[PDB]
Amino acid sequence: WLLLKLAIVFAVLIAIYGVYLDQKIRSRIDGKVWQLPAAVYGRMVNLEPDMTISKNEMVKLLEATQYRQVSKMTRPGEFTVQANSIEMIRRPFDFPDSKEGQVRARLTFDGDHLATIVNMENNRQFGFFRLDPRLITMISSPNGEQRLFVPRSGFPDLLVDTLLATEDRHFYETLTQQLVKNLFLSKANEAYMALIMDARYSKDRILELYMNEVYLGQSGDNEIRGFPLASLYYFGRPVEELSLDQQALLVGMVKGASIYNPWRNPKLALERRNLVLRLLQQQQIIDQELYDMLSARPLQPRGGVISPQPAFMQLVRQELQAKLGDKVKDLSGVKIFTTFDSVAQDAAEKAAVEGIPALKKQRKLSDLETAIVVVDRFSGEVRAMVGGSEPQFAGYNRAMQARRSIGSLAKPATYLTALSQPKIYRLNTWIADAPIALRQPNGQVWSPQNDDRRYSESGRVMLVDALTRSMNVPTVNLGMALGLPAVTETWIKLGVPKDQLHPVPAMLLGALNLTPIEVAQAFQTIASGGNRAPLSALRSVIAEDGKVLYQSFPQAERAVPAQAAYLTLWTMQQVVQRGTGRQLGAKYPNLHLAGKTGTTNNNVDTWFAGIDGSTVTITWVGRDNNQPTKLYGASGAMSIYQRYLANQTPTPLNLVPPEDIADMGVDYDGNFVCSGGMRILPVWTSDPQSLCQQSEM
Amino acid sequence: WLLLKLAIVFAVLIAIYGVYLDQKIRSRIDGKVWQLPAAVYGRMVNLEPDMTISKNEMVKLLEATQYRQVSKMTRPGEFTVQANSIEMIRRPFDFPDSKEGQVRARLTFDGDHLATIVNMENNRQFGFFRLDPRLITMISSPNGEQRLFVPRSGFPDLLVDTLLATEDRHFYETLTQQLVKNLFLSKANEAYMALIMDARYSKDRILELYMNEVYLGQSGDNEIRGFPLASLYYFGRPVEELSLDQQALLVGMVKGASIYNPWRNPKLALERRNLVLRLLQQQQIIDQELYDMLSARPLQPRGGVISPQPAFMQLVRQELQAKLGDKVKDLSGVKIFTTFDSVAQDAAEKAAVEGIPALKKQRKLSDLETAIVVVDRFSGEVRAMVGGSEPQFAGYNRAMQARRSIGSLAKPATYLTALSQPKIYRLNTWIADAPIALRQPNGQVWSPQNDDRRYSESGRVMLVDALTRSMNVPTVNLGMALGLPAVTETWIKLGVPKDQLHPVPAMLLGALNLTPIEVAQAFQTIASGGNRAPLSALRSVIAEDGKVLYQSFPQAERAVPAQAAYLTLWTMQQVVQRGTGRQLGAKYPNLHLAGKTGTTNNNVDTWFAGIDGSTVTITWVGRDNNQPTKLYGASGAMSIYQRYLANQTPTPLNLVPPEDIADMGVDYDGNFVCSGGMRILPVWTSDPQSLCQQSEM
Ligand SMILES: *C(=O)[C@@H](NC(=O)[C@H](N)c1ccccc1)[C@H]1NC(C(=O)O)=C(C)CS1
Ligand SMILES: *C(=O)[C@@H](NC(=O)[C@H](N)c1ccccc1)[C@H]1NC(C(=O)O)=C(C)CS1
């Protein structure tokens, strides 16, 4: 017999093929298994005793951070609402500062402020309590396969059993065969690889690799793979927080994700979900005492979840390039922590989605558009970005790309340049309000007019009223007295791009084309108290091994004096209370908002700059075809800001006067009085006996 | 270990695949291996003592039957030439009568006749000696693969060794691998099949199957496979009769027949032939004492050998359908024995190939054509068929397909109808030669004229002279006296198609459109002595197992009386000696040829019917466009027959007078005389005292 002898070498030749496969499995598994895309997270909110936040504001903040309201808590990422407190189970999160687990706390409130945050385990108060950030999106991997790596513990025991019942009973050496099918191949070859895989790597590793590989959905040209990313994609909570009905649907989609897609066909997807529920009940785990309760819950955010936050993600990407260059991207398992505010965004999106079609019908238009930028008053951190009236599905971001004439938003700069000189210009400084005729290099006569084409009876107005009422004629006169290079110098210090400044008399009235983000920088500089803080979207960039690649730091710069900024901010409160913006100040008088309206020529662009206790908000309302809006600054843009304020809880603006601020009294003539006077104006002076020098006449 | 245990079943699964292959090899080999195409052979010539054949005629007959002239005989199919004898080795042939082997005989001659055929082994005379037939062609197999099966002995020992040296040394268990590669497949599968093939079937069978399978050439869309058919295709002798240089070329072509094809590239083919010769010399068989003698012989008939004898093969195919129907063809290894004469054909082809371009230049024409049919005088067996001036490459066969007006070839029929009545018409019967005017159903006057438009001085001519000189006017008068139905009755008896006979006065002059084969039937009937023998191309059809499928038998039928046919034949000798055909009778007076010329109106068609001692030859010369040839009956057609007679050895016509034939004397008045007379004519009379009844006046 030369049958065995010749075919003995067949066992040898296939065994050496197995040693070749073992060498290949180790090359992949003992190291890089996948190119894990960059995880993009929102702001990490730290709660504190005596912090200004209400019970309702906390529910809205919890709900925005993927937390669920329940009557009785069991799972993490859940909360209960009481008459004066909130009980929650803060989900486990690998924070860059320190990795944390499950923390069950009670948040006791006293109306407007947070009294205590007590651990429900030991009954002890917290010095500060960390709220985990919400996962915004994932930056597209070139491979086209999107995942979120989660270890063995991260998957609950119920889900492992839900998967075991529909697929395998591990105790041999199909689960390890399916792994090698998705992980390596395009039947005999996979069964041979599974023999090696099971023998070398322990059971725990097999189900860890499988639960992060399996195909579960599709978004454009990106594969939604593995149970952890699928959980957030289909419902909106981590894999650990799933209910059994949701686990059954995720488990059911494994053998055919495309036909069990609830977005396309819900009937077949619901039918397959009940099939998983009817498979589990047959086994020792479940009884028909709740099968009809799980099968009764029909499922989902019903959106495509393709490009989450396209307006804000443009800036994130642009800043990742500015700080880390070209890689970044080579690295796998990157964690990006942004300045993004889920509360401010939903409110800004709702103000855009509802406000615009309401202004389109009201004014009888066909193509009105908008742009909203929300930044932190002091730090300059970009909290929210709205690129248009349709912020969900966007291709054009009007917050970073739409360069438009700013209009009357250019007025504070002139007054800030004047109020920078306390020895000359004060709030009671009389500005001429009489006809203007300025000959230019043409030589055509430039005769700017006031909005009503009227001039003051006495032929003058005080500085304070000129900005409050957004008067053009006194603005030019003041701006021409300081000189255009001085006013152009203020703008550079405010943070606006240098190449956009054209020093011509028209600049004082709005001949400055900026994007809402560039406008947000100029208003932030004055709102912080004169400190120019460069606007940012990146807080930190962390690697897989917890290595800090990028870490942002406070880099604020003193641009304009503190007292000049305060005097401008105080006058900006007068525009919101009595001036052009008085329609807002009547709706919210207890917010003491500092603001400025903007209306370009022929109602082409409508602008509003709103300053609360915590944020600087730039709202722009206009048409993409540069056509009339039949809208003003107070209407349109400001009515979108009022909607943004009504959609959330705004912080009231309490202006803390800095050094050398003295509230002085003036008479009808505008002269400082020792005691009394019909008007009280703040003055940048260290010795109020500026009245004595004035009263002596 | 579950390595051996799991892979022990791999030896089992491949062994059961081998038992499947053994079952498949037996299904093919133990029975039908190939669909062997029908072998088509020429006439089987039987030599006899006292037979009329010369030494030179025998050399020509041997050379035509693939026999080679040598100075010293060694191999079969060879012959030597002496002063009065021929020594030959008659090759082995499986004759239908009795299978024979190698016979070395001396053929002693006495000028014109064969004296003795003596076996050179025992020095004994033969009663009859069989000459093997030449293989004409093979009838195309639907499979498209042409072969000629030859057993193990059929291949010489030198050729087996010539093949062994270039390929294998059989003693194991590549020769059996090459077999299964060509015989079954489109490397591992063939080596596995070769293990089975070698183990079950003995060595002898392997080389028998291989030597009949191997690809050696191509002809149109037919594969020339195996050494036996390749031998005749490339050289012209059976595989047994090859020289070592020819064996080496055939052996060399095995690994690549297309690039070692001597028809396309002779340089590479000659180079590879010397490569085989230089491989054999290295081994114990050959020494450099003759390598330079074998390598010095450069090779071949240089023709395509695509469609051998297309004109004659049309009839073979047509008759195979008439006698055996649709199968035939299902059967494999069929042997077809035809009436084909290789000597008559080469001579008829040479007369067409040389004669036509010679008549084209001579007469200054551009498209002259021809057709030649040679049949056996008595049996009616078709010996040769020429379809045109280019008989090698033919698409149109003018012998079976070209229907043309016969002209003066219609004259013998009228005289045969007249000479059938001995009581009325004799050779000395006076026929009127005066103007004719026959009113027809138009009513237009038909006035036929003699070729010279002249009439006899006395106003009459004798019957004998009227046919001899091919006179039109006396032919009509004789034909109208017998009546057209009597003359139409003679034609039916002669064997011409019934639907082509139009009984109108014009028929007597050539208003009869026939093909040369149909003309061959009419002239055969009279040349045999009045016996109509249906013309045939098939002698027998034999199966592979020597089973007689078809066997032809003598089926001659008495059509016209013997004496009437003789009197017509004797007058046909007068046309060749003194009449229209006198140009032939001066070149060959000792042949006493019986003939008739034919010239249609406006020299459109030229015809000649030549009768020798053994054959009836119909020659037609005309243009395919029915245009003037500038040629007559005596010139053109008859000049092609003279070339056919000069290219071979014709049998002299010695007319044996049948019963009641008496040579009688006539005076100038044409009356029978008792003794004397200026003319001697044969008369169908049993009592010559027809002179007494005549002389009494
Ligand atoms: C600033 O934008 C300043 N605008 C104008 O002077 C433009 N050219 C204008 C537009 C409509 C009607 C009259 C003049 C204006 N400031 C505002 C404002 O507070 O929004 C408007 C309403 C007019 S003065
Ligand atoms: C028979 O073919 C008979 N032919 C004619 O009468 C034709 N019409 C003819 C052709 C040319 C010149 C005069 C008449 C003739 N038989 C032959 C012959 O023997 O071949 C010819 C030459 C003229 S009579």
From Swiss-Prot, chains A, B:
Residues 43-134 are annotated as: UvrB domain 2 homolog. The active site is at E167, S408. GO terms for cellular component: membrane; outer membrane-bounded periplasmic space; peptidoglycan-based cell wall; plasma membrane. It is a single-pass type II membrane protein. Pfam families: PBP1_TM, Transgly, Transpeptidase, UB2H. Changing E190Q: 11-fold decrease in catalytic activity. Shows complementation activity in strain defective in PBP-1b. Residues 129-267 are annotated as: Transglycosylase. The keyword Oxidoreductase does not apply. Pathway: Cell wall biogenesis; peptidoglycan biosynthesis. It is found in: Cell inner membrane. InterPro entries: Beta-lactam/transpept-like, Glyco_trans_51, Glycosyltr_51/Transpeptidase, Lysozyme-like_dom_sf, PBP1b_TM, PBP_1b, PBP_transglycosylase, PCN-bd_Tpept. The UvrB domain 2 homolog region (UB2H domain) is important for interaction with MltA. Forms a trimeric complex with MipA and MltA. Has also been shown to exist as monomer or homodimer; homodimer of Alpha and Gamma isozymes can be found. Interacts with UvrA, FtsL and FtsN. In the N-terminal section; belongs to the glycosyltransferase 51 family. PANTHER family: BINDING PROTEIN TRANSPEPTIDASE, PUTATIVE-RELATED, PENICILLIN-BINDING PROTEIN 1B. A third isozyme, Beta, lacking the first 25 N-terminal amino acids of the isoform Alpha and a fourth isozyme, Delta, have been found, but seem to result from the artifactual degradation of the isoform Alpha and isoform Gamma respectively. Cell wall formation. Synthesis of cross-linked peptidoglycan from the lipid intermediates. The enzyme has a penicillin-insensitive transglycosylase N-terminal domain (formation of linear glycan strands) and a penicillin-sensitive transpeptidase C-terminal domain (cross-linking of the peptide subunits). This is Penicillin-binding protein 1B. It comes from Escherichia coli (strain K12). The lineage of its organism: Bacteria, Pseudomonadati, Pseudomonadota, Gammaproteobacteria, Enterobacterales.
